[PDB]
């Protein structure tokens, strides 16, 4: 009767020749191979965003764009005042290395590099601009420019920093100001103190003030190292440096 046991064990082994932990290890082996394939040798580039100005001067060097294969950059064109300018037409040399989806009513270009390390240029003609703008586009840099904004010397058909501060973004060009005793964000760029809080300034009097719908306040004043703030029936005093 042990012949039946022997045949059952042989049937089991030939039916399922894989141990379950061997199956688990082979699944891990497949994941290891997938990590090997999906691993990128060298260095992944740093994701960045940028904003430049393009000049109509003939002596000026033309702008260049860092690009990456398989990743789409967004090009947004603004005028000198920052108003958007709709695009009339464009021309792309070497259409194999680059493709672009562009809605005709829009002003933003979704540009994707297809080849590895071949560079080209793009010609852009705007709605109100007679002068063509040519941008040299180079793939495979160590910083990938996800979003590029470009000022132009002209003006489109459409014609501030305090509201950006009220949003929470620091103003451009200002230096960092460190406060003492309170929680407020301060800056100085043209010897005028700019403060952002949720509290209320009391002592020096605001030269200009703004506030949002949530309860955030921004003020601009002159230089004062000492401030006085009253809230909830209680008055406290704070200081800054420089």
């Amino acid at each position: 009767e042990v012949i039946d046991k022997k045949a059952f064990k042989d049937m089991t082994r030939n039916l399922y020749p894989l141990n379950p932990e061997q199956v688990v290890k082979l699944k891990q082996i497949y994941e290891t191979s997938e990590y090997a394939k999906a691993a990128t040798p060298g260095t992944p580039p740093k994701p960045t965003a940028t904003s430049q100005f393009v000049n109509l001067s003939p002596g000026s060097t033309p702008p260049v764009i860092r690009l990456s294969q398989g990743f789409v950059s967004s090009l947004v064109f603004l005028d000198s005042t920052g108003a958007p300018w709709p695009i009339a037409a464009y021309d792309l040399g070497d259409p194999s290395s680059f493709n672009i989806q562009w809605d005709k009513t829009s002003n933003t270009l979704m540009i994707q590099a297809t080849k590895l390390y071949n560079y080209g240029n793009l010609a852009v003609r705007l709605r109100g601009l007679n002068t063509p703008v040519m941008l040299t586009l180079i793939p495979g840099q160590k910083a990938v420019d996800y979003r590029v904004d470009l000022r132009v010397q002209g003006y489109g058909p459409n014609a501030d920093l305090l509201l950006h501060v009220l949003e929470g973004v620091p103003p451009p060009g200002s230096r960092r100001l460190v406060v003492s005793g309170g929680d407020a964000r301060a800056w100085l760029s043209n010897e005028k103190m700019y403060v952002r809080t949720n509290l209320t300034i009391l002592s020096p009097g605001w030269l200009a003030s703004m506030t949002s719908a949530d309860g955030t306040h921004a003020y601009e004043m002159q230089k004062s190292p000492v401030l006085l703030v009253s809230w909830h029936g209680k008055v406290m005093q704070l200081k800054v440096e420089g």
Binding site: A39, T40, G42, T43, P44, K46, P47
Partner: protein
């Protein structure tokens, strides 16, 4: 002070977040304020080694 936790990990680059929420990405050679610089980036094991003798891990609540 200011505390850092891992937001995303790849080979090569690294993404961290701040105690105030300041998210950032670093290179292998990247001089990070408050922690010196990264001696080595390890993609596995979730270790971000610094020259300040500190290793950044993930948030333990959000793992």
């Amino acid at each position: 002070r200011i505390i850092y936790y891992i937001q995303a990990v790849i080979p090569g680059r690294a993404w961290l977040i701040g105690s105030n929420g300041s998210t950032l990405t670093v290179r292998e050679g990247s001089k990070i304020p408050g922690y010196g610089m990264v001696k080595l980036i390890d993609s596995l094991q979730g270790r971000i080694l610094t020259s300040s003798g500190q290793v950044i891990k993930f948030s333990q609540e959000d793992s």
